[PDB]
């Protein structure tokens, strides 16, 4: 009730903060930056800088399947179903199918009037893998959705509940995490799901409190690969005391000397376009001296980018609750 | 550097007959027309599955039973717990129909019968275009994929004639922001129903790329028999027309709300409603038959000394 509305205000405030400043964070005072951002590393050129696609794969990737050549396998299977004839009942025959392990409740779904549609799949479409689906937010819905909350997927004759992972749609190797799905561009939802060969329409629904489903996102399936790297960015901010000739003393960025000594060998930037790196930590309260390529103004703020490959969450639920009929809000 | 006059710069020295064209055009025309004729004959005829028509009203004021009474040749009415779908036969026009219907708003019914249908008949209000429920259904149908669709208006006869023409203009204006070049029809009398049925029979078919590659089936009749009643599982017998491709037992069968399943037998009984008024040939074993393994089966310091003096 009121806690739900308080969480709605909290999520809207988080959306506004992410929209204003992209993914800045406040550094923890008590928790050391070495142990908080332990798995975060800094990239030099983001896209160009080499990230190994096999470093630190989790246990969930030990349960899924991989294509060594997805394009050629899909083309071969489509060529085979197009040209090569498989023996069986062909198009137009009124057939009956005895299928072995079926729960009783499906019959009670038919008897009260719900339609029942079966489809014979392609090979290798029952196994679980990682699906990347390009989506756009429906203009009819405006409530925020966070990056790892559960949604309902209508993907290619299949309906399932799962937790996606939102990333930017680029043609590079590293794709930045989108912490919130905004209503202007095309994003990619990455999730553990059974293999589906493209093309396939993709619908993202959110279950309301009264049993209604609101249409969140509309799009199509893009690929089936766990080789895609989704990267979460953490931006740290620092304020200079005073400016010398291409030398600045940054405060409010770290709060220990060992934290500055930890995040030393990766470069930093500024909001106004300057670029520099940490020269040496000055105080043992986190204060540091760092050199730049040009003398920056006192109102300039320095930024630091930390990157970590984030994997999606195994929340694959094949059961979707039956809706109530949709109506006015 | 540009050299001056003192450096030497030598000036350079500026040193098919019309019968054959018509025959080629006619050859291409015959090939295209033969391919078109084969594709048009492949649907809804004597050799094909029935033309499936999903009748979706887009307003709360649309009297769906009246429209489905107008739409029903020979009518064979399959009934369910609440809804009814009917097979229609026109041996005059030589065409077979299966009319199903669904109110907008209940998401799974409309989407599951829209992913299998061949034509969608959108019913329209004479005054307004559609409800917000109809707009939600239209957004879902556009996102999922539209097959061949036809728009029909139900209530143009109740109005006075001046208002009839003016409201037809206003309705086309309202609808044109979503269906920009589509002709509305009218559903008032039996002859308008006949013209609508003829329009549905002869119409170019939008092809959905997903269901064309995999086999699929809409259940006409389903029965059950339990292997163990306490286990609440057993052999399900589903009967309907094959639509997309040729199905085989060596690949699985997915039911849209209940996941993957393994067929054990496929038989071909008699067609219950043929247009012009037991046998099984398949082998089961797992030499190439896929299994439901979605997951991989493989698993000197003093007491007073501080760190500086240390």
């Amino acid at each position: 009730d009121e806690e739900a509305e308080a969480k709605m205000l909290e999520k809207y405030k988080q959306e506004r903060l992410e929209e204003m400043f992209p993914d800045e964070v406040d550094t923890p005072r008590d928790v050391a930056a070495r142990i908080r951002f332990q798995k975060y590393r800094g990239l030099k050129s983001f896209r160009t800088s080499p990230w190994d696609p096999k470093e630190n794969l989790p246990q969930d990737y030990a349960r899924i399947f991989q294509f060594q050549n997805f394009t050629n396998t899909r083309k071969s299977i489509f060529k085979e179903v197009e040209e090569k004839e498989v023996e069986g009942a062909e198009v137009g025959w009124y057939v009956t199918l005895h299928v072995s392990e079926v729960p009783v409740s499906v019959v009670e779904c038919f008897r009260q009037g719900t339609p029942l549609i079966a489809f014979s799949l392609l090979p290798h479409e029952q196994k679980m893998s990682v699906l990347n689906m390009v989506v756009r937010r429906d203009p009819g819905n405006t409530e925020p959705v966070k990056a790892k909350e559960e949604l309902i997927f209508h993907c290619g004759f299949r309906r399932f509940r799962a937790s996606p992972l939102f990333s930017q749609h680029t043609a590079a190797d590293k794709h930045k995490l989108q912490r919130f799905l905004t209503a202007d561009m095309a994003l990619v939802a990455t999730v553990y799901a059974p293999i589906t060969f493209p093309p396939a329409s993709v619908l993202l629904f959110k279950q309301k409190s009264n049993g209604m489903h609101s249409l969140i996102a509309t799009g199509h399936l893009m690929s089936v690969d766990p080789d895609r790297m989704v990267i979460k960015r953490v931006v740290l901010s620092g304020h200079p005391f005073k400016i010398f000739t291409k030398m600045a003393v940054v405060r409010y960025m770290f709060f220990n000397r060992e934290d500055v000594l930890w995040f030393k060998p990766v470069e930093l930037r500024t909001k106004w376009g300057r670029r520099g790196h940490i020269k040496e930590p000055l105080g043992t309260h986190g204060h540091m001296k760092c050199s730049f390529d040009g003398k920056l103004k006192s109102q300039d703020t320095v930024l630091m980018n930390l990157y970590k490959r984030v994997f999606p969450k195994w929340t694959y639920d094949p059961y979707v609750p039956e809706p109530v009929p949709w109506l006015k809000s | 550097h540009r050299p001056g006059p003192l450096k030497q710069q030598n000036k350079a020295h500026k040193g098919l007959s019309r019968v054959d064209q018509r025959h080629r055009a006619s050859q291409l025309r015959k090939q295209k027309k033969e391919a078109v004729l084969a594709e048009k004959r492949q649907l809804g005829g004597k050799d094909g599955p029935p033309h499936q028509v999903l009748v979706v009203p887009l307003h709360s004021r649309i009297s769906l039973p009246e429209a489905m009474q107008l739409l029903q040749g020979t009518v064979h009415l399959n009934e369910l717990g609440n809804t009814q779908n009917f097979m229609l036969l026109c041996p005059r026009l030589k065409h077979r129909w299966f009319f199903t219907s669904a109110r907008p708003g209940d998401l799974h019914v409309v989407l599951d019968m829209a992913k299998v249908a061949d034509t969608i008949l959108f019913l329209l209000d004479p005054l307004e275009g559609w409800d917000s429920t109809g707009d939600y259904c239209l957004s879902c149908l556009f996102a999922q994929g539209l097959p061949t669709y036809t728009l029909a208006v139900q209530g143009i006869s109740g109005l006075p004639l001046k208002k009839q023409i003016d409201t037809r203009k206003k309705l086309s204006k309202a609808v044109e922001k979503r269906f920009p070049h589509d002709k509305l029809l009218l559903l008032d009398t039996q002859q308008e129903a006949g013209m609508l049925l003829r329009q549905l029979a002869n119409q170019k078919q939008q092809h959905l790329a997903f269901r064309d590659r995999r086999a699929y089936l809409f259940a006409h009749a389903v029965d059950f028999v339990p292997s163990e009643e306490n286990n609440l599982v057993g052999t399900l017998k589903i009967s309907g027309y094959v639509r997309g491709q040729t199905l085989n037992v060596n690949r699985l069968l997915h039911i849209v709300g209940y996941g993957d399943f393994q067929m054990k037998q496929i038989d071909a009984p008699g067609d219950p409603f043929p247009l012009n008024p037991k046998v099984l040939m398949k082998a089961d074993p797992g030499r190439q038959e896929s299994l439901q393994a979605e997951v991989i089966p493989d698993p000197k310091v003093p007491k007073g000394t501080s760190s500086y003096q240390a």
Binding site: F65, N69, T73, L261, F263, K264, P265 | -
Partner: peptide, 23 residues
């Protein structure tokens, strides 16, 4: 004595293979 770049040298890339479907 570790920093951000040295600890990345201690990351093995041969443990959690997904099963590969060949061609």
């Amino acid at each position: 004595k570790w920093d951000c770049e040295s600890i990345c040298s201690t990351y093995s890339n041969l443990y959690n293979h997904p099963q590969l479907i060949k061609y």
